[PDB]
Design a protein around this ligand. Structure first.
Ligand code: VCG
Ligand SMILES: *[C@@H]1O[C@H](CO)[C@@H](O[C@@H]2O[C@H](CO)[C@@H](O)[C@H](O)[C@H]2NC(C)=O)[C@H](O)[C@H]1NC(C)=O
Ligand SMILES: *[C@@H]1O[C@H](CO)[C@@H](O[C@@H]2O[C@H](CO)[C@@H](O)[C@H](O)[C@H]2NC(C)=O)[C@H](O)[C@H]1NC(C)=O
Ligand SMILES: *[C@@H]1O[C@H](CO)[C@@H](O[C@@H]2O[C@H](CO)[C@@H](O)[C@H](O)[C@H]2NC(C)=O)[C@H](O)[C@H]1NC(C)=O
Ligand SMILES: *[C@@H]1O[C@H](CO)[C@@H](O[C@@H]2O[C@H](CO)[C@@H](O)[C@H](O)[C@H]2NC(C)=O)[C@H](O)[C@H]1NC(C)=O
Ligand SMILES: *[C@@H]1O[C@H](CO)[C@@H](O[C@@H]2O[C@H](CO)[C@@H](O)[C@H](O)[C@H]2NC(C)=O)[C@H](O)[C@H]1NC(C)=O
Ligand SMILES: *[C@@H]1O[C@H](CO)[C@@H](O[C@@H]2O[C@H](CO)[C@@H](O)[C@H](O)[C@H]2NC(C)=O)[C@H](O)[C@H]1NC(C)=O
Ligand SMILES: *[C@@H]1O[C@H](CO)[C@@H](O[C@@H]2O[C@H](CO)[C@@H](O)[C@H](O)[C@H]2NC(C)=O)[C@H](O)[C@H]1NC(C)=O
Ligand code: NAG
Lengths: 49, 281, 49
């Protein structure tokens, strides 16, 4: 699973608004809003993929 | 492609008495001639059940109504239907019922049973439907308007082919179908029982226990659900896709489960024949 | 001595008149002790004393 220049086919979720319950999956890519700063789907200050 | 139906008479929901229904076999264990105490999520006895309709009463002051609202799922759902014509045919379970989150689609469409989990783009007013032909006496399914698109699908299952009895009927309701839906630790548990009836107005009073059927390994969050009803269309029903339809006659009931302790009575053959709701009074 | 699909114990196996539902593999007595099993190859119900 390793590659010389890095293997970028593997992903993990870093941002979520709550914790998962047992055996749940979530494959949503809805952009995460941080800092009570409204975000309309755009990466930027306080808005993360 | 889907359409918003526009001819419904604006009428209130009805409410009824759940009596003693909603019991199911809590485990896959054979027991007999014994009383057993258990704890699970059950429909409380004599609970408040919301009553929805599919019906067409003709006349200027018509009451045509085709109820397919989105209801909360809460901690699990007691669902029951009474019908004569195979109108109530599947459901949708999920959190947004939209393209942004995976959701569960269970549809009993003519000739198969389809279960899919996908990021579906659902119709605001989804339905199935059967057209009655003019040149013969057959009824056929032609309308499948549940979602406009789907992607990122998992857990896809389709049952073996069969023929469906799509013919409309008159008379009292003939088939009572009861289901219990629970969403626990990654699984969607479905319990079921079918009982023959000859009743017209409301849920029959009586007692039965549902069998486990299946336990689906679907890791999704369910907070809302919608019931899918079929429409009847015919050569005698003029109008475009938003008005050229008639509700058939069927009804359904929705209750909610709560943690309860029950005393269940198993008869000599291991059938649950009675029960006591320890929190009723 | 016996092992029925992983459930072990001892006792006397006899033919039974109990009829298990299609999804029930084991039965239980009044004190939750297995007192009947469905044999895994020939689907007979046996009592265990
Ligand atoms: C590990 C994955 C497991 C795979 C899935 C196995 C089956 C799971 C299905 C559960 C319920 C299906 C939805 C019922 C539609 C509701 C309205 C309705 O119409 O349904 C009742 C009448 O039509 C249904 C039809 O029965 C026709 C009765 O008129 C039958 O189709 C069968 O599906 C599985 C085998 O093909 C089950 C049974 O329906 C549920 C009762 O068992
Ligand atoms: C299951 O879905 C519900 C409904 O969307 C989630 O609860 C909401 O969470 C957001 C934050 O992401 C809050 O702003 C809403 O007020 C919550 N609504 C309700 C009714 O509580 C719930 O977190 C989801 N479960 C999991 C494990 O993610
Ligand atoms: C059924 O009616 C709903 C409104 O109740 C329509 O949904 C709206 O569509 C417009 C245009 O795309 C959006 O800007 C709105 O935000 C939508 N509203 C909601 C609540 O989602 C829907 O398109 C209609 N469907 C059909 C088949 O006619
Ligand atoms: C189920 O609960 C509803 C309330 O959620 C009951 O309806 C209310 O009844 C009172 C009179 O006792 C009215 O003043 C309210 O306006 C009604 N609200 C509604 C329908 O939203 C209903 O009667 C209960 N039904 C059963 C069978 O217990
Ligand atoms: C009910 O749903 C099933 C499953 O989606 C339909 O059968 C599939 O039809 C497509 C073509 O549209 C084929 O490519 C698949 O191979 C079929 N699957 C199976 C298991 O047969 C079925 O046609 C639908 N019923 C009606 C009346 O349209
Ligand atoms: C009853 O008659 C209708 C025609 O009035 C038949 O429906 C046609 O079937 C052919 C072959 O599948 C299709 O190409 C046509 O588009 C259908 N017409 C319509 C209006 O849908 C129907 O099959 C006949 N019923 C039976 C049992 O044979
Ligand atoms: C879910 O489906 C979408 C398609 O609607 C996949 O979309 C990816 O989109 C990015 C750009 O944002 C592209 O670079 C990728 O190549 C697309 N994927 C593929 C397979 O072509 C998304 O990857 C899917 N996610 C999951 C978990 O299946
Ligand atoms: C356990 O099952 C037996 C059948 O295997 C039931 O006995 C029969 O009941 C029917 C009525 O439903 C009678 O017509 C038969 O004559 C009975 N047969 C015998 C041999 O007695 C029995 O009633 C069931 N027990 C319970 C508690 O439900
Ligand atoms: C093989 O399995 C079948 C079905 O359970 C059973 O009837 C048969 O007796 C078994 N056979 C052996 C060990 O030959």
């Amino acid at each position: 699973d390793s590659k010389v220049g890095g293997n970028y086919n593997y992903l993990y979720r870093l941002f979520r608004k709550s914790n998962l319950k047992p055996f749940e999956r979530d494959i949503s890519t809805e952009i995460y809003q941080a800092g009570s700063t409204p975000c309309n789907g755009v990466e930027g200050f306080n808005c993360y993929f | 492609q889907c359409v918003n139906l526009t001819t419904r008479t604006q009428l209130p929901p009805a409410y009824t008495n759940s009596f003693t229904r909603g019991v199911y076999y809590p485990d896959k264990v054979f027991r007999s001639s014994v009383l057993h105490s258990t704890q699970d999520l059950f429909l409380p006895f004599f609970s408040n059940v919301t009553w929805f309709h599919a019906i067409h009463v003709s006349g200027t002051n018509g009451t045509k109504r085709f109820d397919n609202p989105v209801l909360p799922f809460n901690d699990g759902v007691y669902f029951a239907s009474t019908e004569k014509s195979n109108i109530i045919r599947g459901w949708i379970f999920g959190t947004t019922l939209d393209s942004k989150t995976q959701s569960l689609l269970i549809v009993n469409n003519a000739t198969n049973v389809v279960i899919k989990v996908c990021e579906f783009q659902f119709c605001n007013d989804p339905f199935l439907g059967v057209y009655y032909h003019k040149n013969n006496k057959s009824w056929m399914e032609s309308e499948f308007r549940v979602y406009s698109s789907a992607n990122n699908c998992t857990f896809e299952y389709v049952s073996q082919p069969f023929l469906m009895d799509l013919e409309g009927k008159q008379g009292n309701f003939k088939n009572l179908r009861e289901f219990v839906f629970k969403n626990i630790d990654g699984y969607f548990k479905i319990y079921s029982k079918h009982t023959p009836i000859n009743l017209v107005r409301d849920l029959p009073q009586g007692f039965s226990a549902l069998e486990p059927l299946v336990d689906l390994p679907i890791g999704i969050n369910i907070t809302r659900f919608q019931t899918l009803l079929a429409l009847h269309r015919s050569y005698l029903t003029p109008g475009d896709s938003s008005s050229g339809w008639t509700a058939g006659a069927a009804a359904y009931y929705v209750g909610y489960l709560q943690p309860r302790t029950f005393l269940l009575k198993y008869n000599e053959n291991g059938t649950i024949t009675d029960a006591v709701d320890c929190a009723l009074d | 001595n016996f092992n029925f699909n992983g459930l072990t114990g001892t006792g006397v196996l006899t033919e039974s008149n109990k009829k298990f539902l299609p999804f029930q593999q084991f039965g239980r007595d009044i004190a939750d002790t297995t007192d009947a099993v469905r044999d895994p190859q020939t689907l007979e119900i046996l009592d265990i004393t």
